[PDB]
Amino acid sequence: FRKMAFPSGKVEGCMVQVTCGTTTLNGLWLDDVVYCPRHVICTSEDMLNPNYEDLLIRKSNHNFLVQAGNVQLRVIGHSMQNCVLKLKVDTANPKTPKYKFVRIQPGQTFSVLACYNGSPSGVYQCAMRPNFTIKGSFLNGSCGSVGFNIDYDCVSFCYMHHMELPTGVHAGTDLEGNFYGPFVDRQTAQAAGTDTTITVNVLAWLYAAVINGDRWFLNRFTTTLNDFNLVAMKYNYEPLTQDHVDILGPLSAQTGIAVLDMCASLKELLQNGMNGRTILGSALLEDEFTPFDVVRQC
Amino acid sequence: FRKMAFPSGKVEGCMVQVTCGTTTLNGLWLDDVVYCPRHVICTSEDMLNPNYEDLLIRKSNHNFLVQAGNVQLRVIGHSMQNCVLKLKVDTANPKTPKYKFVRIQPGQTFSVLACYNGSPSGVYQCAMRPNFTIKGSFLNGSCGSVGFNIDYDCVSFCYMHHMELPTGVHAGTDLEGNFYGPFVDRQTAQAAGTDTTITVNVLAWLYAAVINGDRWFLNRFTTTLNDFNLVAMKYNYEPLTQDHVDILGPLSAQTGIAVLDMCASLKELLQNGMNGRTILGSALLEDEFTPFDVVRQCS
Ligand SMILES: COc1cccc2[nH]c(C(=O)N[C@@H](CC(C)C)C(=O)N[C@@H](C[C@@H]3CCNC3=O)C(=O)c3nc4ccccc4s3)cc12
Ligand SMILES: COc1cccc2[nH]c(C(=O)N[C@@H](CC(C)C)C(=O)N[C@@H](C[C@@H]3CCNC3=O)C(=O)c3nc4ccccc4s3)cc12
């Protein structure tokens, strides 16, 4: 089992650069609109606590340099939506895929196309942590790179990159400019909530183990959702939601193991440890494979 | 620090479907030629001991059905190169990138674009193991998927997929159709030679751990190159050459840790273990990052 990204070509065709003064970041060109982080308009001395409304009043369409490679796209309008700038340009992107903007939940995974100066550098799979950070790999100049899923040729954009916390994890917004978690776009040290283990993904991993014949950990007990959630919190595990139970449905049907029966199996693992026995060849439970990732790889 | 693949768009525009009779697998369309595994011509009976040149002489151009998306491309010729079939078509691929065919060395990495029915499914990073297998993720119908590196808009193709061993690892060929390793395109259960760990890559990765602010495994000791190699061979690690030491130089300079000092740290980890501690989130020593991979990501 491995972390697999989606093929990135449909997103590569949409990356451009956006420059104000000497500040260049990545933007996303869809139809005739370019989306990018609003702090492209910030000077170094306004970053501590910028006045974005006041900074944007001073800007005009002709202050924005938008380039696809070396080709300039003329800007004919601009607006701000939360923490993203929307630049209307005079050309509709001929490589625009079928697409949606979506806001994901903690535990969901997505692919990140890491870009520098509008040019793709690499692709990898990330999971949104319960404290709304991602464990990414981003350098200076990566802001504006996006994360996405692809379903039947439709790209669902879910992440745009804005910042690196002092602990080395990353934070950003959806494509409507709303941050995931309690962060703000200022040059300031911010801290995330203490992280927790993604319970729904650990259960998906147990299902994958069963599918491959590794099932020693199954037991004859069951539990209520509420009883399991109260126990999980004592072990720094996320509580399960109704949506979590539902996305485990296909794996539950495939193995014949009820979701609440698998919860009682995980609950025994939590109170007693693994006893040096492994699951799928590991002493550690994996929590960054979603139920969809598991059926993707089968 | 994550396992990072190359962006796959330049390869996506080359993937097609090839069908013969009831068999379907993926092909690579470059200019006017489609490359695919030759056993697309095999029927089920043929699989065990196919005489390929004999089976190929009995095929006509019109037996090959090549599809790019919804469009069919007409085969105007065909030839075989080792385990790869080369189908000449009447249309040139306009999305053909600049490219080259290369044979990689054990321990080098590449990106794999997994495809089914000519459609890209996922992309991830693999290393050519010392025993010439790869620990990939491939299901039925993945044959013909390719592995590649990218350098300044030039795509270097190095792997085409052919089989899964009983142990679950994978085997394939370069784009001239020669297998990596002692494998053969027969429907038989085949075993690989005993694998070993890629030592220069483990060292590159420990350096990455330092760059990302993790130092719990460093120590005050030092070792000679030969004495490290004796312990490494004991633990089934490949020997470390002076070429590898030089290669790690940029990394050593960056962190101020001499190569043989980092070797002393790896020696202790091999002799004492990790004691349930973690490195970059892993409980095991990672060996599928090359020194180039580390430099490219960290800077
Ligand atoms: C004293 O303040 C700190 C204390 C402790 C940790 C800290 N982290 C950050 C922080 O992240 N700032 C944001 C920017 C702010 C405005 C969101 C930022 O630099 N984003 C980067 C990606 C970063 C860089 C390293 N790899 C990460 O992913 C990015 O690309 C952008 N660059 C610029 C350059 C100019 C103008 C806009 C942008 S946006 C500040 C900070
Ligand atoms: C008693 O035989 C075994 C015993 C123990 C383990 C074994 N493994 C294999 C084995 O791998 N065979 C090759 C095929 C051989 C000819 C190279 C094969 O199936 N390749 C797959 C990719 C495979 C499938 C599962 N995931 C992997 O990646 C592929 O796509 C192709 N399918 C066909 C189907 C028909 C015709 C051509 C192709 S080519 C056989 C075998």
Author numbering:
A (entry chain A): 3 to 300
B (entry chain B): 3 to 301
What does the paper say about this structure?
The main protease (Mpro), also called 3CLpro (3C-like protease), represents an attractive antiviral drug target. Mpro is able to cleave pp1a and pp1ab at 11 sites, catalyzing the formation of a series of non-structural proteins critical for virus replication and transcription. In fact, a variety of studies previously demonstrated that only the dimeric form of Mpro exhibits enzymatic activity. Here, we showed that a peptidomimetic compound with benzothiazolyl ketone as warhead, YH-53, is an effective inhibitor of SARS-CoV-2, SARS-CoV, and MERS-CoV Mpros.
In order to figure out the inhibitory mechanisms of YH-53, we first determined the crystal structure of SARS-CoV-2 Mpro in complex with YH-53 at 1.93 Å resolution using the cocrystallization method. Specifically, YH-53 exhibits an extended conformation in the active site, which is located in the cleft between domains I and II of SARS-CoV-2 Mpro. The benzothiazole group of YH-53 is well accommodated in the S1′ pocket of SARS-CoV-2 Mpro. As clearly indicated by the electron density map, the carbonyl carbon of the benzothiazole group in YH-53 forms a C-S covalent bond with the sulfur atom (2.14 Å C-S bond length) of catalytic residue Cys145 in SARS-CoV-2 Mpro. This nucleophilic addition reaction results in the conversion of the carbonyl to a carbinol hydroxyl, which forms hydrogen-bonding interactions with the backbone NH of Cys145 and a water molecule for stabilization. YH-53 contains a pyrrolidine-2-one group at the P1 position which matches the S1 pocket well. The carbonyl of the pyrrolidine-2-one group forms a hydrogen-bonding interaction with the NƐ2 atom of His163, while the nitrogen atom forms additional hydrogen-bonding interactions with the carboxy groups of Glu166 and Phe140. Moreover, the side chain carbonyl of Gln189 forms a hydrogen-bond interaction with the main chain amide group at the P2 subsite, which creates a more closed conformation in the SARS-CoV-2 Mpro-YH-53 complex. YH-53 presents a 4-methoxy-indole group at the P3 position, which occupies the S4 pocket of SARS-CoV-2 Mpro. Therefore, YH-53 occupies the active site of SARS-CoV-2 Mpro by covalently binding to Cys145 and noncovalently interacting with several conserved residues, including His41, Phe140, Gly143, Cys145, His163, His164, and Glu166.
